[PDB]
Amino acid sequence: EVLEVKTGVDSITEVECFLTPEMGDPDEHLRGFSKSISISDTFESDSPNRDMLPCYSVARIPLPNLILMWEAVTLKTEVIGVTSLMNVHSNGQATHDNGAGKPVQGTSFHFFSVGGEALELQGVLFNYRTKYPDGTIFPKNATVQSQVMNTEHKAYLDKNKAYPVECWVPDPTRNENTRYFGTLTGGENVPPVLHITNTATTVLLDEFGVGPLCKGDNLYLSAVDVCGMFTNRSGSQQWRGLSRYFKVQLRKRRVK
Amino acid sequence: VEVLEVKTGVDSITEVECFLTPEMGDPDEHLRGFSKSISISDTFESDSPNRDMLPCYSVARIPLPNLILMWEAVTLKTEVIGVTSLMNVHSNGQATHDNGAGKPVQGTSFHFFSVGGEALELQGVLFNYRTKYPDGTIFPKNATVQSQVMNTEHKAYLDKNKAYPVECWVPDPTRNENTRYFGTLTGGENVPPVLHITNTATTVLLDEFGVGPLCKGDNLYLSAVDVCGMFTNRSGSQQWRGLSRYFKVQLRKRRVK
Amino acid sequence: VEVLEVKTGVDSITEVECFLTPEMGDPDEHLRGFSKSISISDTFESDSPNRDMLPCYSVARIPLPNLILMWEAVTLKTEVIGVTSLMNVHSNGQATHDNGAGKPVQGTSFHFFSVGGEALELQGVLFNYRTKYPDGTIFPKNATVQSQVMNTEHKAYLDKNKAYPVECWVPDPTRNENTRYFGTLTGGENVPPVLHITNTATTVLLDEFGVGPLCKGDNLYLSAVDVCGMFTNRSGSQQWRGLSRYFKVQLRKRRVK
Amino acid sequence: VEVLEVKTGVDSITEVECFLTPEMGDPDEHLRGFSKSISISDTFESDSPNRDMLPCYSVARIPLPNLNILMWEAVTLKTEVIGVTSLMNVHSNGQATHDNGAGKPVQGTSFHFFSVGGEALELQGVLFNYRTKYPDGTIFPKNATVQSQVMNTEHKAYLDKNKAYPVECWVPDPTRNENTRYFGTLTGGENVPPVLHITNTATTVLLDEFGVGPLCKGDNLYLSAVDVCGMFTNRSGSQQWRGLSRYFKVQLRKRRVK
Amino acid sequence: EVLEVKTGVDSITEVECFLTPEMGDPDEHLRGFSKSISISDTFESDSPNRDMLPCYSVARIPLPNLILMWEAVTLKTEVIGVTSLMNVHSNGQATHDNGAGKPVQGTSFHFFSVGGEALELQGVLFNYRTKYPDGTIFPKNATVQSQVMNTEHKAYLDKNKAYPVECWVPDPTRNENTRYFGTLTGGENVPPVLHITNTATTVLLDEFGVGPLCKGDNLYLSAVDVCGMFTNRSGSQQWRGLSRYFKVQLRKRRVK
Ligand SMILES: CC(=O)N[C@H]1[C@H](O[C@@H]2[C@H](O[C@]3(C(=O)O)C[C@H](O)[C@@H](NC(C)=O)[C@H]([C@H](O)[C@H](O)CO)O3)[C@@H](O)[C@H](O[C@H]3[C@H](O)[C@@H](O)[C@H](O)O[C@@H]3CO)O[C@@H]2CO)O[C@H](CO)[C@H](O)[C@@H]1O
Ligand SMILES: CC(=O)N[C@H]1[C@H](O[C@@H]2[C@H](O[C@]3(C(=O)O)C[C@H](O)[C@@H](NC(C)=O)[C@H]([C@H](O)[C@H](O)CO)O3)[C@@H](O)[C@H](O[C@H]3[C@H](O)[C@@H](O)[C@H](O)O[C@@H]3CO)O[C@@H]2CO)O[C@H](CO)[C@H](O)[C@@H]1O
Ligand SMILES: CC(=O)N[C@H]1[C@H](O[C@@H]2[C@H](O[C@]3(C(=O)O)C[C@H](O)[C@@H](NC(C)=O)[C@H]([C@H](O)[C@H](O)CO)O3)[C@@H](O)[C@H](O[C@H]3[C@H](O)[C@@H](O)[C@H](O)O[C@@H]3CO)O[C@@H]2CO)O[C@H](CO)[C@H](O)[C@@H]1O
Ligand SMILES: [K+]
Numbered sequence A, E: 001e002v003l004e005v006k007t008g009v010d011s012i013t014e015v016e017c018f019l020t021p022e023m024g025d026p027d028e029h030l031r032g033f034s035k036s037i038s039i040s041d042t043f044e045s046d047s048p049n050r051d052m053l054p055c056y057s058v059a060r061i062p063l064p065n066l067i068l069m070w071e072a073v074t075l076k077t078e079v080i081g082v083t084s085l086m087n088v089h090s091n092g093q094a095t096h097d098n099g100a101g102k103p104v105q106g107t108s109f110h111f112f113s114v115g116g117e118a119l120e121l122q123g124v125l126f127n128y129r130t131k132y133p134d135g136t137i138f139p140k141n142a143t144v145q146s147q148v149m150n151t152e153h154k155a156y157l158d159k160n161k162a163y164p165v166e167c168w169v170p171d172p173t174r175n176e177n178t179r180y181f182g183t184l185t186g187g188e189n190v191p192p193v194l195h196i197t198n199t200a201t202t203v204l205l206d207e208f209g210v211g212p213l214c215k216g217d218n219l220y221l222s223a224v225d226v227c228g229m230f231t232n233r234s235g236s237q238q239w240r241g242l243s244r245y246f247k248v249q250l251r252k253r254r255v256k
Numbered sequence B, C: 001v002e003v004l005e006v007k008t009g010v011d012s013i014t015e016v017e018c019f020l021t022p023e024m025g026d027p028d029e030h031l032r033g034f035s036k037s038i039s040i041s042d043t044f045e046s047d048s049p050n051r052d053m054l055p056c057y058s059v060a061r062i063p064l065p066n067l068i069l070m071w072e073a074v075t076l077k078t079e080v081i082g083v084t085s086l087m088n089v090h091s092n093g094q095a096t097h098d099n100g101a102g103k104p105v106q107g108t109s110f111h112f113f114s115v116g117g118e119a120l121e122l123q124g125v126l127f128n129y130r131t132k133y134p135d136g137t138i139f140p141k142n143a144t145v146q147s148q149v150m151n152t153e154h155k156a157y158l159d160k161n162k163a164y165p166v167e168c169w170v171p172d173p174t175r176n177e178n179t180r181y182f183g184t185l186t187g188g189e190n191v192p193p194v195l196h197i198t199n200t201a202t203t204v205l206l207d208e209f210g211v212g213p214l215c216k217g218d219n220l221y222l223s224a225v226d227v228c229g230m231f232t233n234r235s236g237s238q239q240w241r242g243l244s245r246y247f248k249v250q251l252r253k254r255r256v257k
Numbered sequence D: 001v002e003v004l005e006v007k008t009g010v011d012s013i014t015e016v017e018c019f020l021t022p023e024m025g026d027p028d029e030h031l032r033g034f035s036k037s038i039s040i041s042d043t044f045e046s047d048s049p050n051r052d053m054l055p056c057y058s059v060a061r062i063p064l065p066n067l068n069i070l071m072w073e074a075v076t077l078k079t080e081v082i083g084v085t086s087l088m089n090v091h092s093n094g095q096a097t098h099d100n101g102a103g104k105p106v107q108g109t110s111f112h113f114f115s116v117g118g119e120a121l122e123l124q125g126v127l128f129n130y131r132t133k134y135p136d137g138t139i140f141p142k143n144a145t146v147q148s149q150v151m152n153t154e155h156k157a158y159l160d161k162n163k164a165y166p167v168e169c170w171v172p173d174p175t176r177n178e179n180t181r182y183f184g185t186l187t188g189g190e191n192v193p194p195v196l197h198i199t200n201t202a203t204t205v206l207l208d209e210f211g212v213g214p215l216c217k218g219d220n221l222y223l224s225a226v227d228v229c230g231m232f233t234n235r236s237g238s239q240q241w242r243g244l245s246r247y248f249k250v251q252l253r254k255r256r257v258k
C-alpha cells in the first residue's frame, strides 16, 4: 500500500556517485582492463581465468535515516572518461604500415540499474561445460538446459567483482522494485558510440507513478560498461571498461 | 463476434508470465541452443538440410482460468534472456587474428514474437523450391517454382513446437486478425547482434478499435524466434545460436455476443 | 475535380487485399524470384544487358466496385512476404570462409511501393546513356548524354508488367499528384538486408487537405519493387533476389464536382 | 524590413517547380553527371586538381510573378533526388567485387545539400590544404593562408554562378544566410553505402521561429543543391564522382512589409 | 535566488563567434592537423609529443556590462568546413590500385558546451604510466586508479592549447551552471557523418526554466571537433579537426 508523497524542503534528497568497472585487473598497473583473452583447445575444456572475466559492479548507498521510505524518481547517468579511448599511441597494433594504433572496439555491454534492493539475476551460459573459476559466483549444478533457461540459476547482485557478466542477466521474472536498462552490441569491429550530456534525465516511476522504494534506507546502483577490447602490438586482446556516473533524486513516501 | 463491454472488479484481470526456449536444432546432448554446423549443397536440386541444422519457430499454448466471456490480451512485456552469454569469446572459437580473442556470435539474425488468441497463421515461402526438407519437420508441400515468390497453397498453423522451420514460413499477412506479431530479419554474414534489455517497456496489444487478441477456448498463444547469429568454431564451421524469450501478458475479461 | 463530402453508411467503404510478385528476370523455369547472373560489359559503349538480367517494376490495376462519386484510398498496410527465406544459407552458396556457411543475400537493395488512383508516372534516368536495353523492355528512347542527369523527354506510365526496368525509371516527382509513393535505395555490395514485419502498422494516405488518392474509372493502382540484394553461388556469380509484397488498402466513397 | 500581415485570396499564393542538374566535372561529351577519374598528387604542397575533377555547387535563380510593398515569402518545400535507381546499373564497365561477381556499385563519400532563399546563398571558404592550387575557371578562396585550413573570414562569396564554386572549398556561411534555409549532410569514407529515400508525401516547413519564411528580394527565388552520391569504380580501379539532379517544389505567399 | 526576467527592447543580446580547433599544429603549414601518430615500443613507455595531442578549445566572451545577470537561453551551433573532407587528391593513400585517396575517417569526438563560468573537468587516463608532455595540463600524481576514477584530477578549462582531449572529460559531479553535449565514435574505419543547417536550435534552460547565468558578465564556450584521421600516402596518420560556430541568445535575469 503506497500512500501520498511527503512535501516540504525536508522531503527530498539526492545521491551522486561513480561506480568503477571490474574488468579483471590482471596486475597492479591494469585497473580497467582484463587479462588477455585465451581460447580453449576444445569446446568442452573452456576454463576462463578469473582476471579474464568482467563482472557486474554494484554499490549500496545509505540514505538519510527515516512508515516512510525514500522513493527514487529520476536518474542522470553517463560513462566517465570516454575520451581516454582516443589514446592510439600506447603500444597498440598498427592498422597498417606506419599507421596509428587500433582503437578500443568490438563487443560491448552497457548496463545500469537503480533499485530499492539488490538487482535480481538469472543465469544463462553460452557453454554449460565451461569451468568458472574460484573467486567468482556462477550458476551451480549447470546442465545442458542452462544454455537456454534453467530456473535454478537465481541470484542477487550482492557483492563486487564476483558475478561474471557472461553468466548473468537481470531476471525479468523479478526486479519489481528495480528499473534496469542494457544493450549488448557484439562483433569484433563494432565501434564504440558513447554520448555524454548533463541535460538528459530518465524518469524511474512506473505506470502507477511509483518509483523504486528503498528498503532499510539503502539505494542499490548497478552497472556494466565493457567498452570493447584493446588490441596490443602482439595481437593479444583485453577487455577495457570505464566508470559510470549516477545521480538519483529521491523523495519521502508514506506506505502502510 | 460482436465485442461488448470489459468486466471490472478484482476478479476480472489475470497475468501470464513465462519463457519460450529456442529451437535451433540441438544436434547432440551438449548443444541445446545451437544447430548442427551448416553445410552447403553443390546444386539447388540437391539441397537436403538435416533436421538438426534447421532452426524452428517456438510456440506455447497457455491455459487461462476457465470462463459468453473471453480473456482479452491488453499488454505485453518481452525480452531476450541471456544476452551477455554472447560475451564468451574464449570457448574454442576462431581467433580474429594472430593471438586475438574468438570471433563472437554474429551474422544473419531473426528476432520475432507474437501474442494471439489462437495459433499463429503461416504462409510458406521457399528460397529454393527444390529444397528437400527432412522427416520430422512440417514444411510447404507440393512446392512449385512459384513457391519461391508466392504460392497460396502453403497455409498452416503454428501448432507444434520443434516442427516448423524458420526459413520456410512467415506470418500470413492475409490472416492473423486475432494475433499481433512483430519481427526483424537482419541478414549479412558480419552483422553485429544489437540486443536491448529493460523492464520499463510495454507494448499495447489493442487494435485501432481498442480490442486486443481474444482467447478462444481460454488459451493464449505465444510464439517466438530468436536466432541471434552464428557461432564460428576454430575449424571455421558455423552453427546457429539462439536464446530464450520472456513474455509477460496482462489480460482482462471481455463480453462478446 | 472539386472534392466535396465523404459518404457514410455501411455501404460506403471497401477493401483491397492482394500481393504483388517480384519481377527479377526469371532466367529459367526453376528461378522465379531471381535474375540471370550478372555479367559486366568491357566498356560503357558496349553495355548491353539481357532482359532476364534486369529487374522490373511490379504493377497491378485492381478494379473497384462500379460507382459523381469516386473511391478514395485512405490507409495502407504493407509487408514484404517471405523474409525468413533468406536464412537458407545451405543451398549452393559461396562459403564465407573455409568450412563456413554460405553467404546470405546482401548488397544493393531497392524497396519501393505506391498506391494511386491512376498509373504511377515515371521519369527516365540512365546510369550510362549508351546502354542498349533489350527487346521486350520499355526504356527511355532517343537517349542523349543529358539522360544521365535529367532529360524531360523520358516520360512514361507504369502500365505493364515485366516491362519497365528498375534501373531506367523512377517515380516522376513533377507529376504523381494522385499517387502516394515511398522508396529506399541502399547501395553497396555488403549492405545487410533489414526487413521488418508486423500487422500493427498502418500508413495514412491522406494529403495535407485530408484527401487520399481518388480512383479514376474505379481502378486502384498498386506498384512495388523489392530487390533484396544479390545471391552469390559457389562460383562467385551473383543474381538479384526479390520477394513479394502484401498490400491492404481501405477505401471510402467521396463526392466530387 | 518590418514584416506585417500575409495577404489572402485566390491571387495570394504561387508555386515554383523545377530541377537542378548536378555539376560533377563532365570530363567528356559522354560523361555528364560524372567527374574525371581522381588522381593523387605526389606531395601535400603540390595538390593541383583539374577543373573536370572538382564537383561544384548548383544554383538556380527563379523569377517570380511581379509584385511592385509586397514580397513573396517561401513557406514550404518538397525535394527529392532524381534517378536513385540508376545506381543499380552494376553491369557497365565496373570492377567486379570478386572473381565472377557483379560490378561494385557507386559508394563512398557523399554530400547531399539543398537550400531555399530570397537571395543568393552566402558562402564561407574552408580549405583542406591551403597550398592546394585551384584551377582556372573555378571561383575559390583567394589569398589563402594556413589559417584558411580552419577559419579565414576573408573567404566570403555568393553562390551566384554555375560550374564555378567547388564543393570542397566552400560551405554555407553560418554567420550570414538569415534570409535562406539550408540543410546538408557529409557522409565520409570510401565504403559508405548510399541511402537514398524518395517519397512525394514529405514537406519541409521554411518558416523561422517567428513564423516568417525567406522573403524574395526583387521577386527572385534562389535554389541551390549538391548531390554527390559517391564514386563509381571502373574495371581498372579508377574512380569518378557520380551525382544526380534534385527536384524542388516551393509554395510561396504574399507578405506585406514596411 | 533567481527572480524575474527583464523585458524591453534592451533586455536581450546575442553572441556569435567561431572556435578554431587545436589539433597540435606540428608546423607552419598544418593548422588543423596533429603531428603524425607514433606508437610506443612498450605500454609503460607511452610518451606522446605535445603536437600529437588534440586539446579542448575554449573562449570567454565578454557581455554588455551590467543584481542582474545575463542568462543563456538558446544555442545554434555547426561544424564549419565539412566539405573540405572531400579532398581525396592531396597526397593521401589510395584505397586500392588506381583508386582515390582514403578520406578522413576513424575515431572522432564532437563536443560543445555553453556556460556562465569555465567548464569543469575530470581526468581519466587510458594508461596511468603515460608520460604527458611539457606544455600540456594533465592529471598530476597519477595512480593506477586514474585509469578508472581518481577524484584528485579536477580542473577548469581555463586555457587554450593546453588540456588534452584524451585526458579530460566534463565533470558530471559539477557543471551545474553549464550545458554540455558530446559524442565519442571510436574505430579506425568510422565514417564521419556531419550535418549542417541554420534551422536547428538547442534550448539551454534546465527543468526549472533557468539557463546558464553568466558570472562577471562572461559567457564561456567550449568545443572539440576531432573529425577523424587523415592518412598520408606513406601510411602515417594525423588527427584532423574543424572549427565550430556558436550563436547564443541571452536575456537579463534578476537575482537576489
Ligand atoms: C607477447 C607475450 O609474451 N604475451 C603474453 C603476455 O606477456 C606479457 C607481455 O605481453 C603483453 C602482450 O600480451 O602483448 C604486452 C602488452 O604491452 C601488455 N599490455 C598491457 C595493456 O599491459 C600485455 C598485458 O599486460 C597482458 O596481456 C595482460 O594479460 O602483455 C610480454 O611482452 C612480456 O614479455 C616479457 C617476457 O616475459 C620476459 O621474459 C622478458 O624478459 O621481458 C618481456 C617484456 O617485459 O611478458 C608479459 C607477461 O609477464 O602475458 C599474457 C598473460 O599474462 C599472455 O601469456 C601473453 O601470451
Ligand atoms: C572439423 C570437423 O571435423 N568438423 C565436423 C564435426 O566434427 C566434430 C568436431 O568438430 C567440431 C567442428 O565442427 O569444428 C568441433 C567444435 O568444437 C564443435 N563445436 C561445438 C560448439 O560443439 C563442432 C560441433 O559440435 C559440430 O560442428 C556440430 O555439428 O564440431 C571434430 O573436431 C571431431 O573430430 C574428431 C574426428 O572426426 C575423429 O576422427 C577423431 O578420432 O576425434 C576427433 C575429435 O573428436 O568430430 C566431431 C564429431 O563428429 O562433425 C560435424 C557433424 O555435423 C561436421 O561433420 C563437421 O564438419
Ligand atoms: C615518410 C616520412 O618520412 N614520414 C615522417 C615525416 O617526414 C615528413 C614527410 O613525410 C610526411 C609523411 O608521410 O608523414 C609526408 C606527408 O605528405 C605529410 N603530410 C601532411 C598533411 O603534411 C606528413 C606530415 O607533415 C608529418 O607526418 C607531420 O607529423 O609528413 C617526408 O616526406 C619528408 O621527407 C623529406 C626528407 O626528410 C628529406 O630528407 C628528403 O630529402 O625530402 C623529403 C621530402 O621533403 O620529411 C618530413 C619531415 O620533415 O616526419 C614525421 C615527423 O614530423 C614522422 O617522422 C614521419 O614518420
Ligand atoms: K507537379
Ligand SMILES: [K+]
Residues within 6 Å of the ligand: D174, D175, D176, E016
Ligand atoms: K548572423
